[model samples]
Target: ADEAIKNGVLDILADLTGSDDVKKNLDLNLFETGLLDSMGTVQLLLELQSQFGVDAPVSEFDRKEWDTPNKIIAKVEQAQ
Candidate 1:
């Protein structure tokens, strides 16, 4: 796994979720827990694009495809 991308994504998640506690909850469903909402999702994509240069257009997003920190990291890194 890419450690740099992982760490950077973690920091972003921590900031977006307004808590540094998700470090240990990488696979936890943030949506189910209410830590992630519609606005949070939007900001996340924008932040990922700005920070990682991942071209994840908001229109291509599907909530079910990304619900956890790990999945978000995967998508961002896998994006072209």
Candidate 2:
């Protein structure tokens, strides 16, 4: 896995959740736990695209495949 991209994802999650503790909950169900909302999703996709140069456009996003940090990391790496 790419440490830089993983850290970037964590940073974005921390910013959106307003908790530096997010790293401890990498597997947390963002939507179910209320850590991520629609707006947060949009911001995440935008950040992934801009910061990581990933093509995670909303149209192709599958919540089930992109719910948690680990999954995000997998998808980002897969795209790379």
Candidate 3:
């Protein structure tokens, strides 16, 4: 993935998780940390579409597949 794209997704995740610290915790489990709830997951998909033009279907969201910041970034880049 492009560095800019990767960083941008990190920014989005940080904002969604309500903590600048999230940017540093690349491997942190977002769900276990309660940083991203189900509602936030929807917003995540929306942001991916609005910012990167990656149309991630809501139905495609799976907890195990998108467990951490890096994984989410990977998912976004691959979708594009």
Candidate 4:
């Protein structure tokens, strides 16, 4: 899970959002930069499911949960 999360964070920089100047630092404002929209956020959740076997329940689907990459990762790790 540790390795997968590390890799997922990187993949998000390119494939998910196409940000070339990606910093490895954690972010609490991923959505603010338009890197990920609502639809992309949904796709990201699905990606998490397929990649990490994380079952993100619908109950956890909310704006607050998808607000930032840091929060998302923390929630995913907990939800997984």
Candidate 3 lDDT trough over 10 residues, lowest sum = 56-65
lDDT of each model, Cα atoms only?
0.77, 0.78, 0.81, 0.64
Which sequence of candidate numbers ranks them by lDDT, best first?
Answer: 3, 2, 1, 4
Residue 6, candidate 3: alpha-carbon lDDT: 87
Candidate 4: tens digits of C-alpha lDDT, residues 1-80 = 48677567557644566665334545645566677676776677687777766776655576665666666667767865
Q: Give the winner by TM-score.
A: 3
Alpha-carbon shift of residue 22 in model 2 (angstroms): 2.4
Ranked by TM-score, top first = 3, 2, 1, 4
TM-score of each: 0.81, 0.83, 0.84, 0.68
Q: lDDT of candidate 1? A: 0.77
Candidate 1, residue 41: how far the Cα is off, in Å:
1.5
Candidate 3: list runs displaced more than 4 Å.
none
In candidate 1, which residue pairs clash? none
TM-score of 4: 0.68
Q: What is the lDDT of residue 74 in candidate 2?
A: 78
Q: lDDT by residue for model 3 over 1-80, one digit each (tens)?
A: 37877888898888888898679988878889888888887877777887887866577666765779888888888887
TM-score between model 3 and native = 0.84
Q: Which whole-number lDDT from 0 to 100 does residue 77 have in model 3? A: 80
Per residue, candidate 2 scores C-alpha lDDT tens digits across 26-77 of: 6877777788887887888888887787887587578876778777777877
Q: Distance from true position, residue 37, model 4, in Å?
A: 1.4
